[PDB]
Amino acid sequence: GDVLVTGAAGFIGSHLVTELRNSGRNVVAVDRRPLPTGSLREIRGDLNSLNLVDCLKNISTVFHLAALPGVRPSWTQFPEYLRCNVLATQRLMEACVQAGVERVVVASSSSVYGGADGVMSEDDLPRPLSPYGVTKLAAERLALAFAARGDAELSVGALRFFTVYGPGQRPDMFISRLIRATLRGEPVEIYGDGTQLRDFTHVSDVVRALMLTASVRDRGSAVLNIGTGSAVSVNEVVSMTAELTGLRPCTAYGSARIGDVRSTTADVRQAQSVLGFTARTGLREGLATQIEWTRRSLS
Amino acid sequence: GDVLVTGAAGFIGSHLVTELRNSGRNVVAVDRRPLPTGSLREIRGDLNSLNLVDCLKNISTVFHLAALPGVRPSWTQFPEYLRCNVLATQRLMEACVQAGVERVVVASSSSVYGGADGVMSEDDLPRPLSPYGVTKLAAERLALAFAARGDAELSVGALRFFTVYGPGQRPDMFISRLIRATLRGEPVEIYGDGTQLRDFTHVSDVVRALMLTASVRDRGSAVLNIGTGSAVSVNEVVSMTAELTGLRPCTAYGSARIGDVRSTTADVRQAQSVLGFTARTGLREGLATQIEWTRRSLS
Ligand SMILES: NC(=O)c1ccc[n+]([C@@H]2O[C@H](COP(=O)([O-])OP(=O)(O)OC[C@H]3O[C@@H](n4cnc5c(N)ncnc54)[C@H](O)[C@@H]3O)[C@@H](O)[C@H]2O)c1
Ligand SMILES: NC(=O)c1ccc[n+]([C@@H]2O[C@H](COP(=O)([O-])OP(=O)(O)OC[C@H]3O[C@@H](n4cnc5c(N)ncnc54)[C@H](O)[C@@H]3O)[C@@H](O)[C@H]2O)c1
Ligand SMILES: O=c1ccn([C@@H]2O[C@H](COP(=O)(O)OP(=O)(O)O[C@H]3O[C@H](CO)[C@@H](O)[C@H](O)[C@H]3O)[C@@H](O)[C@H]2O)c(=O)[nH]1
Numbered sequence: 001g002d003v004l005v006t007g008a009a010g011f012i013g014s015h016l017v018t019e020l021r022n023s024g025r026n027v028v029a030v031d032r033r034p035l036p037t038g039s040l041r042e043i044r045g046d047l048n049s050l051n052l053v054d055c056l057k058n059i060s061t062v063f064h065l066a067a068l069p070g071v072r073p074s075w076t077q078f079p080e081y082l083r084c085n086v087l088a089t090q091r092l093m094e095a096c097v098q099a100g101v102e103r104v105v106v107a108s109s110s111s112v113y114g115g116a117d118g119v120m121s122e123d124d125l126p127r128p129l130s131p132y133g134v135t136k137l138a139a140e141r142l143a144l145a146f147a148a149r150g151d152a153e154l155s156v157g158a159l160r161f162f163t164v165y166g167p168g169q170r171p172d173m174f175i176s177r178l179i180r181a182t183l184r185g186e187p188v189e190i191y192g193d194g195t196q197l198r199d200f201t202h203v204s205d206v207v208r209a210l211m212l213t214a215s216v217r218d219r220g221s222a223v224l225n226i227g228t229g230s231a232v233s234v235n236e237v238v239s240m241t242a243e244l245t246g247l248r249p250c251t252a253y254g255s256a257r258i259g260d261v262r263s264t265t266a267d268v269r270q271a272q273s274v275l276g277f278t279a280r281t282g283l284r285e286g287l288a289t290q291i292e293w294t295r296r297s298l299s
Numbered sequence: 300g301d302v303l304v305t306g307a308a309g310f311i312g313s314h315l316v317t318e319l320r321n322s323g324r325n326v327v328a329v330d331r332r333p334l335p336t337g338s339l340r341e342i343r344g345d346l347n348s349l350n351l352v353d354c355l356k357n358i359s360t361v362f363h364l365a366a367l368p369g370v371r372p373s374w375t376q377f378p379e380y381l382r383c384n385v386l387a388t389q390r391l392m393e394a395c396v397q398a399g400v401e402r403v404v405v406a407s408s409s410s411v412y413g414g415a416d417g418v419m420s421e422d423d424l425p426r427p428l429s430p431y432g433v434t435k436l437a438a439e440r441l442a443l444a445f446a447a448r449g450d451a452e453l454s455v456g457a458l459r460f461f462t463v464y465g466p467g468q469r470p471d472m473f474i475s476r477l478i479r480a481t482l483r484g485e486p487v488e489i490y491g492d493g494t495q496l497r498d499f500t501h502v503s504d505v506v507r508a509l510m511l512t513a514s515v516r517d518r519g520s521a522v523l524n525i526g527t528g529s530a531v532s533v534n535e536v537v538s539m540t541a542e543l544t545g546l547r548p549c550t551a552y553g554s555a556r557i558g559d560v561r562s563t564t565a566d567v568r569q570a571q572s573v574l575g576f577t578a579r580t581g582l583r584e585g586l587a588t589q590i591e592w593t594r595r596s597l598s
């Protein structure tokens with residue numbers, strides 16, 4: 001059957017569209033922004049306005065990536081985060097039940113874990129530290145509640161991504177801003193002392209995990225971390241970018257932002273056992289891919 | 300300091316207002332519906348429209364009970380459930396940070412557990428089966444995220460209530476409808492075969508738990524079940540009501556409603572250790588209190 005991707009114009013979504021089409025799948029793309037062997041049908045619209053059942057005609061698999069994804073604006077833009085991240089999810093899942101979609105792969109987030117040292121496992125109680133994390137937890141729990149309805153023949157794979165980077169990374173993210181601070185001298189502010197850590201996951205690995213998750217169809221629903229299990233500090237990413245480029249990143253240290261967790265590290269075990277997924281790209285290699293893409297993109 | 304109760308016109312809220320005032324506390328009541336030794340100041344308004352910081356002047360303790368509380372309408376009224384249960388909570392917690400409120404006691408729900416046999420413990424992963432349960436989980440996680448902000452001197456006691464009944468019970472609830480089916484012959488539909496079970500908790504016990512929770516001020520935040528640990532089936536409640544009244548309840552069996560969990564039973568241990576709270580009222584005694592109140596109320 002055909003596949004529908006919400007959020008298809010965005011960072012992860014555009015990579016997923018490419019891989020789906022290269023694999024021979026016909027793709028229906030939904031986004032309110034323009035898109036950058038399988039066919040491609042672009043539907044331009046807001047999930048809260050489109051006739052979603054019409055969009056889901058002959059769709060057997062949905063990848064739900066649309067959302068407002070920034071941690072820090074969520075404190076002061078909460079109506080819009082609720083509308084885009086929770087209400088739109090609820091509408092999409094109802095339409096999936098009505099249209100007889102078989103499987104929905106939902107982008108969730110490591111943000112549901114909140115603050116924790118060391119490994120974040122899918123059996124840990126969620127305790128988001130930001131309103132954004134609350135909305136991603138609500139979206140993933142909504143998806144699971146729809147899959148548990150007695151009238152639905154619907155499974156859900158909810159994927160908790162860990163800070164994704166690479167070619168095309170959204171420009172509000174740290175590595176994208178740092179690379180512009182390096183190649184173009186546009187200063188980046190460091191939010192705190194730079195000792196915060198992230199499990200940075202390359203988008204190519206995330207797209208492989210998304211495809212694997214969609215192919216697990218007879219095992220019910222699942223909640224899985226998608227990450228590398230290796231955390232790197234902000235300061236270390238700055239030093240690596242300086243080393244790779246021979247240009248001094250234009251940085252300025254400022255105050256930590258409330259809502260930012262101090263460290264993330266994925267427990268990678270359950271995705272390996274359920275999907276056969278292990279991340280292949282480490283940060284040193286992946287960072288070079290983003291730097292090279294950004295050069296060519298600016299030229 | 301003075302205490303503010305949101306949802307003060309409702310079932311649990313009105314009982315809490317009474318006990319707060321009888322205890323000598325000055326109460327500020329907020330609700331968009333009229334209210335049925337401590338003074339009482341009634342503020343009439345919607346939490347999404349009022350100047351909440353103004354309402355919180357000289358308030359040291361907030362009891363957040365306002366919400367749309369029905370499980371079953373939440374599938375088809377989801378915008379309003381998000382607005383009342385999640386957006387209003389976020390606005391209230393921000394105003395609590397800005398106003399320097401010390402402690403917020405939040406009404407959460409056993410609905411966050413979803414479907415589970417046997418005892419529901421606060422260490423179990425939440426898995427709500429209805430959009431209502433998703434909104435209560437979001438409200439309680441929001442409250443905890445605000446309490447964890449570095450700029451807040453704020454603690455949260457989040458109370459997961461188990462199906463509350465007694466004098467004044469909301470008329471959409473089962474025991475209220477059954478009593479009208481008995482005393483007044485207004486038929487009640489049974490949603491399924493009546494073998495579903497609930498941990499029914501008397502409102503007097505819930506109000507005692509609310510007061511105890513507010514008095515724990517130097518131990519940070521807590522998430523606690525408030526229930527009896529004894530589950531009773533719908534059919535057994537029907538037979539008890541018939542026995543107590545000598546009138547045949549006017550019932551009609553119909554189809555189970557999607558979103559209704561099959562059974563609830565509270566793990567009562569953590570509230571006993573943290574609050575010294577143990578429920579005192581069992582269903583046979585409590586059911587008689589509601590029947591007697593309802594007689595006098597109808598006359
Ligand atoms: N990038 C990461 O590090 C990361 C980490 C964890 C989780 N996630 C999650 O992965 C998903 C994709 O993230 P991304 O970095 O690609 O974000 P992105 O902002 O690049 O892509 C999201 C897309 O969704 C669209 N969109 C938003 N609301 C919409 C609406 N109401 N209707 C139609 N389209 C709408 C946007 O136009 C955008 O193109 C998001 O759900 C996000 O929460 C991302
Ligand atoms: N009754 C139960 O069995 C039970 C069980 C678990 C949890 N809870 C929770 O306990 C709390 C109280 O439940 P209840 O049975 O007393 O419900 P209720 O409906 O009787 O009381 C809720 C009150 O909140 C008010 N309200 C709703 N939205 C408002 C808004 N935007 N602004 C101002 N006021 C608003 C309503 O007018 C109403 O009086 C709710 O948070 C509910 O989710 C109740
Ligand atoms: O200009 C900036 C931007 C970010 N940071 C810091 O860099 C780290 C990473 O920030 P960023 O790349 O913006 O990603 P996160 O805020 O960690 O969020 C990403 O990863 C989260 C967890 O996976 C997802 O929930 C989010 O949607 C996704 O944006 C954090 O410690 C920030 O405090 C700075 O110092 N300066």
Ligand SMILES: O=c1ccn([C@@H]2O[C@H](COP(=O)(O)OP(=O)(O)O[C@H]3O[C@H](CO)[C@@H](O)[C@H](O)[C@H]3O)[C@@H](O)[C@H]2O)c(=O)[nH]1
Nearest residue numbers: 368370408409410460461462472473474488489490495559
């Ligand atoms: O007309 C009716 C109403 C209810 N029921 C059944 O009676 C049980 C109890 O229903 P009700 O008294 O409406 O309470 P719940 O739906 O269990 O919800 C209450 O208890 C939940 C868990 O504590 C809270 O989350 C909710 O806010 C609160 O309304 C359920 O099995 C219903 O299916 C019927 O058979 N007929």
